[PDB]
Design a protein around this nucleic acid. Structure first.
Ligand SMILES: [Mg+2]
Ligand code: NA
Length: 1217
RNA sequence: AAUUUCUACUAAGUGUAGAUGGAAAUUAGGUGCGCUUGGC
DNA sequence: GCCAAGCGCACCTAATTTCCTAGAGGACG
DNA sequence: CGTCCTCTA
């Protein structure tokens, strides 16, 4: 047997199957005539309106409770939370207080007399109408009288808000786990950074943010946290931290802005405050003012013309500022000024090419007077900060004879105005009144471009003009220039609101209608499938050969299908007969202790007292003999209950064997499910569809086409297995199915069409049939061009698991006794999205390859898809759409499509090699920092892999085989959340990443040297700590013999004594100032360096000779070369041809490991590149953990640490060879 | 260039291969642009 | 040119909760 | 009392 074989039927999970519902016969005509779809579409709109009106009540209920609550456990909790030496029993007391703090909040809600009525019909029928004051709102609510069952789920979503448990949707969790934690962390930050703020800044926040009713420091003491339970107080507190924007546009500074300013001034790095999260269900209104935007295309065009045409206001000032700057030479150069900040940087780049030239030229003139060098540049930075403004006459001093600044300014303002004119010539037709759009502005890229190119050039002109304001408050100021300048600039500034508002409109996703749910006038439509509820739900399933049907009875003919006989003679549909006894532990007492039943039988006071007391449950009041008789009472009653005794041919165990009541309940639950089919006359049923008393839909996907011939979708297999005699409860059909209408979203005639009898190009370059010619047209996106019904069907897998064990423990036992267990190591990155290495139980590489491309073979045809290229494309189309105001397209479907190929290949590897999976213990935190590279796939890869391994099916297998659809493998624990995962998830192990890639696989050598240059004396010490440094004539290499015991914090190394060589090349990454690269030849570079300084490098050991240098540049250049030598991973940014791994150390045969010597080979014994090396050593770090399982008794496997330490790893990697 | 839906296809002619947990609710994040005040 | 703190708008992405029910019971003509 | 919607565990 294998290890996989042990992991079937371990736990339950639910899934949904989705199908198209094709109306059959006169079904559609009858639905058209009764106007059912228009009623359902209006209902969904009204339903969202009532949901919004309920939230208005719910929120008022919440705030009245939260505004009045004083947390009792609070000060004890904060005190203990801030303790830094906590005993393990103090940590336990902290959890107890956290829990009790959430119980205070939950009981405050749930202790209200009205709480229960908030989630029954009372809230719609009575409570909400009395709360409301608007005749039309009240009438919207009243329209759901008799339909409140439709809110049962929404009432569960609202009930979740009032839980006491540490659950993400709970109010208490938001208050105590999240916001109280940030409030307390912020208190500590306040006590550190307190003194940075001066009286004026703290008084400003008090006045403009705190309504002069509080001091800023109040919100950093524990007793004020109650103020911050409601959104109103969260806004105030977050304004303290972040400030707000006034009606005038002024940005008032919060504490975090002041902290930043101080940090940027003192070059320090003080910590910043965290803002609190929003209160659940609050309707947020910002404390900052933001002007009113636009609401219609017509309005965007009227504003664009009124404000930007030729004879418009904003234009005429561009015309003014132009002629103004074209006459600079009537105003004193001494009185016009460029304020010392971004203005002087801007002007520097536009006059001297680079932002820093003006400061540089000023620094040189400072040096000329004032000539300790870190003192200096600090004073000289200060002395230069004290200058507020530079006049144009002063800036002329910096020009070089060929250059005059004023004339250079002129051509700049000419350059930009010519750019403005140019764009108007492309905006001729837009400014005409006779023009009106052929397309809407959220879907008319050509018109948006003409506007955006216009708006851009005006902003470009405006930012250049803004540099000429100066500080303003300078005396010498030429008010014959500023007078007209200030007037034409303050009008141009009006473009800021227009630019902002036009982008805010024009980049809006256009409206797309959602599908909507169908009820067929029944508030509990299709609620379940039980035969005894057909009349209440009015939906059933029929089968005619291989085709399946949904059958719906009209509200006025609920019985119309039960009475149908069989047509012994002609044809018959098969009508489903489904029986379910759900949740026997609750159902059985509710039915047999009911008035409708306690009339029939009478439970003895013996039977009555025991359920009244609670002596049935395992707990603090147990008694096995009571549940024994209780079980026999239930068993006795099941016989007398007709609609159960005949539905499930029960086969209970001998009563004396149950240990608690849940032992009886599990047999009732498992046996309380039966699905069969009864016959029904096809002619009689079809007539019902004709007459309109029955609606019929084929449950359809393409696997049910008459033309289908390939392997079905896995979901088709699940669906058909629902009704297969070999399915003995492994997959159950559940209630809760739903039916929707998705209106067409594309016009048929607007679709891309490959017309019949014209050859279509095949796109797969490995496909030798280059063309396909069909006798019928084929349309792009055909399915969205017709209205479609869709049916969603929930199923339950392994509802009654028999293999209950701790899955993690079982894997460890199995690995312990496996004499040769395989490992799939998976390195996750961005140069290679995913890299796979499979090892055997001795660490021999069995398979290795990147998954940037997916290789598939079918029908002899090979196909290769470069998903790394596709995602890179999509990522760049999205980056451009954002900057151009064009459509931002989805990437997550492409990711999902890519990841599904990956997951499929990993499942084949798992099955082929019976292998566990090794991954890097990537903390949540590294993963969010790489989310900016939208190609990123780390977490989506994890979610889909874990999901598939919750129920893993080779869909080619026999369905009754282990690993077929009825006996799926369950080798990860049931996905509840990431939050709750450990470093083992069944067959998946997460191990420490440290030096899995930057390590020589052939020796175990790693770079543990600190080679950043710091000073001459440190460089001399570093050099002298080598045992020898010499040139080796016979190899043309420099040798650097070292004992790691002579260097700082090298303890993890095992071998200690290494000989490094200047062997081969490296790629030096650096910025000139963005990331560039150059190849370096090490030996040749060392010779260049030593020659530059007259160093006779042939002179045997040269450690002492190198320490005779006095130039800092020598030691600095020498340390850089050492870093390059110790840099084993080398790559070009965005390049497939360079990502090699090269070792500066020889192995036992005198060979340097060079991954490129393995890149060539098709079957390689060592990794083929650095990413393969990463995956290899990730797998080996799990081999190590397996080695720990084997050193341990079985009873203790659960407590074996799987995280190899850094010291253990180097030892392991340096003794494996 | 067809789909319950998605990705890649045309796969032998209305389709092929793999994947696919829906619904509702809550909440958070990332990118991009503008504005405020600042730092190389 | 790059970057920080903060406010705003637009977009897409995604984490974590809950249900996946038949039969008693009530309202009502 | 028959039917339809609500509620419960
Ligand atoms: Mg198929
Ligand atoms: Na942002």
């Amino acid at each position: 047997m294998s290890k996989l074989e042990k992991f079937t039927n371990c736990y339950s999970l639910s899934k949904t199957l989705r199908f198209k519902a094709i109306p059959v016969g006169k079904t559609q005509e009858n639905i058209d005539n009764k106007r059912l779809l228009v009623e359902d579409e209006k209902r969904a709109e009204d339903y969202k309106g009532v949901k919004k009106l309920l939230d208005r009540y719910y929120l008022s209920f919440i705030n009245d409770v939260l505004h009045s609550i004083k947390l009792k456990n609070l000060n004890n909790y904060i005190s203990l939370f801030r303790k830094k030496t906590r005993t393990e029993k103090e940590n336990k007391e902290l959890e107890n207080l956290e829990i009790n703090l959430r119980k205070e909040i939950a009981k405050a809600f749930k202790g209200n007399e009205g709480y229960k009525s908030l989630f029954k019909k009372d809230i719609i029928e009575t409570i909400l109408p009395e709360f409301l004051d608007d005749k039309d709102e009240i009438a919207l609510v009243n329209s759901f009288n008799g339909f409140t069952t439709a809110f049962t789920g929404f009432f569960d979503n609202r009930e979740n808000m009032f839980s006491e448990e540490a659950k993400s949707t709970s109010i208490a969790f938001r208050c105590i786990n999240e916001n109280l934690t940030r409030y307390i962390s912020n208190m500590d930050i306040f006590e550190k950074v307190d003194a940075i703020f001066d009286k004026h800044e703290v008084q400003e926040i008090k006045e403009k943010i705190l309504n002069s009713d509080y001091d800023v420091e109040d919100f950093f003491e524990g007793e004020f946290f109650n103020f911050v339970l409601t959104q109103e107080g969260i806004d105030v507190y977050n304004a303290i931290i972040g400030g707000f924007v006034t009606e005038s546009g002024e940005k008032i500074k919060g504490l975090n802005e002041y902290i930043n300013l101080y940090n940027q001034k003192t070059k320090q790095k003080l910590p910043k405050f965290k803002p609190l999260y929003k209160q659940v269900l609050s309707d947020r209104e910002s404390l900052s003012f933001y002007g009113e935007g636009y609401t219609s295309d017509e309005e965007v065009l009227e504003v664009f013309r009124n404000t930007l045409n030729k004879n418009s206001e904003i234009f005429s000032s561009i015309k003014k500022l132009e002629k103004l700057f074209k006459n600079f030479d009537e105003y004193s150069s001494a009185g016009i000024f460029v304020k010392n900040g971004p203005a002087i940087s801007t002007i520097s780049k536009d006059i001297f090419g680079e932002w820093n030239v003006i400061r540089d030229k000023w620094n040189a003139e400072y040096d000329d007077i004032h000539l300790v060098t870190e003192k200096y540049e600090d004073d000289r930075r200060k002395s230069f900060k004290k200058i507020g403004s530079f006049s144009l006459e002063q800036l002329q001093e910096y020009a070089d004879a060929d250059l005059s600044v004023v004339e250079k300014l002129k051509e700049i303002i000419i350059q930009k105005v010519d750019e403005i004119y140019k764009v108007y010539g492309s905006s001729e037709k837009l400014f005409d009144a006779d023009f009106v759009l052929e397309k809407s502005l959220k879907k008319n890229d050509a018109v948006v471009a003409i506007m955006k190119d216009l708006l851009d050039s005006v902003k470009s002109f405006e930012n250049y003009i803004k540099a000429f304001f100066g500080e303003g408050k300078e005396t010498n100021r030429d008010e014959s220039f500023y007078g007209d300048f200030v007037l034409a600039y303050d009008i141009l500034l009006k473009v800021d609101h227009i630019y902002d508002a036009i982008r805010n409109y024009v980049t809006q996703k256009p409206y797309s209608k959602d599908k909507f749910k169908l009820y067929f006038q029944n508030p509990q439509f299709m609620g379940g499938w039980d035969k005894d509820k057909e009349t209440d739900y009015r939906a059933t399933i029929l089968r005619y050969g291989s085709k399946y049907y949904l059958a719906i009875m009209d509200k006025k003919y609920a019985k119309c299908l039960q009475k149908i006989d069989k047509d012994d003679v002609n044809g018959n549909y098969e009508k489903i007969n489904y029986k379910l006894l759900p949740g026997p532990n609750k159902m059985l007492p509710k039915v047999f202790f009911s008035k409708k039943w306690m009339a029939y039988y009478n439970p003895s006071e013996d039977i009555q007292k025991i359920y009244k007391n609670g002596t049935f449950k395992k707990g603090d009041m147990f008694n096995l003999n009571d549940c024994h008789k209780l079980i026999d009472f239930f068993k006795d009653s099941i016989s007398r209950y007709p609609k159960w005794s005949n539905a499930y041919d029960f086969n209970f165990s001998e009563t004396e064997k149950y240990k608690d009541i849940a032992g009886f309940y599990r047999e009732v639950e498992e046996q309380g499910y039966k699905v069969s089919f009864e016959s029904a006359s096809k002619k009689e049923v079809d007539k019902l569809v004709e007459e309109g008393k029955l609606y019929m839909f084929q449950i359809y996907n393409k696997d049910f086409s008459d033309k289908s011939h390939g392997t079905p979708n896995l979901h088709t297999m699940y669906f058909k297995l629902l009704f297969d005699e070999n399915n003995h409860g492994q997959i159950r059909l559940s209630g809760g199915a739903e039916l929707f209408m998705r209106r067409a979203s594309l016009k048929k005639e607007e679709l891309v069409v490959h017309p019949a009898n014209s050859p279509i190009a095949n796109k797969n370059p490995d496909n030798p049939k280059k063309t396909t010619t069909l006798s019928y047209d084929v349309y792009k996106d055909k399915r969205f061009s017709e209205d479609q019904y869709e049916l969603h069907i929930p199923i339950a897998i392994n509802k009654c698991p028999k293999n209950i064990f701790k899955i993690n423990t079982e894997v460890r036992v199995l690995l312990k006794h496996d004499d040769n267990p395989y490992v799939i190591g998976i390195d996750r990155g961005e140069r290679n999205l995913l890299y796979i290495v499979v090892v055997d139980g001795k660490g021999n590489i069995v398979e290795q390859y990147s998954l940037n491309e997916i290789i598939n073979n079918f029908n002899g045809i090979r196909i290769k898809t470069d998903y790394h290229s596709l995602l890179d494309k999509k990522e760049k189309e999205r980056f451009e759409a954002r900057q151009n105001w064009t459509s931002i397209e989805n990437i997550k479907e492409l990711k999902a499509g890519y990841i599904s190929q990956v997951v499929h290949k990993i499942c084949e590897l798992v099955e082929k090699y019976d292998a566990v999976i090794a991954l890097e213990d990537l903390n949540s935190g590294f993963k969010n920092s790489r989310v900016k590279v939208e190609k990123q796939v780390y977490q989506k890869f994890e979610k889909m892999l874990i999901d598939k391994l919750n129920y893993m099916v080779d869909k080619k297998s026999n369905p009754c085989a282990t690993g077929g659809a009825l006996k799926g493998y369950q080798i990860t624990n049931k996905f509840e959340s990431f939050k709750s995962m450990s470093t083992q998830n069944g067959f998946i192990f997460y191990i420490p990443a440290w030096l899995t890639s930057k390590i020589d696989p052939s020796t175990g050598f790693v770079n543990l040297l600190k080679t950043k240059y710091t000073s001459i004396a440190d460089s001399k010490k570093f050099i002298s700590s080598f045992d020898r440094i010499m040139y080796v004539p016979e190899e043309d290499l420099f040798e650097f013999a070292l004992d790691y015991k002579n260097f700082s914090r090298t303890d993890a190394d095992y071998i200690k004594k290494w000989k490094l060589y200047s062997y081969g090349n490296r790629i030096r990454i650096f910025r000139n100032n963005v990331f560039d690269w150059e190849e370096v030849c090490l030996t040749s570079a060392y010779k260049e360096l030593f020659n530059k300084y007259g160093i006779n490098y042939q002179q045997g050991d040269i450690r002492a000779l190198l320490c005779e240098q006095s130039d800092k540049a020598f030691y600095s250049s020498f340390m850089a070369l050492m870093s390059l030598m110790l840099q084993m991973r080398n790559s070009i940014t965005g390049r497939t041809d360079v990502d090699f791994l090269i070792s500066p150390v020889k192995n036992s045969d005198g060979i340097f490991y060079d991954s490129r010597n393995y890149e060539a080979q098709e079957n390689a014994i060592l990794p083929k590149n650095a990413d393969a090396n990463g995956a290899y050593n990730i797998a080996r770090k799990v081999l190590w953990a397996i080695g720990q399982f084997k050193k341990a008794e079985d009873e203790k496997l659960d407590k074996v640490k799987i995280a190899i330490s850094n010291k253990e790893w180097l030892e392991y990697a340096q003794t494996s060879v």
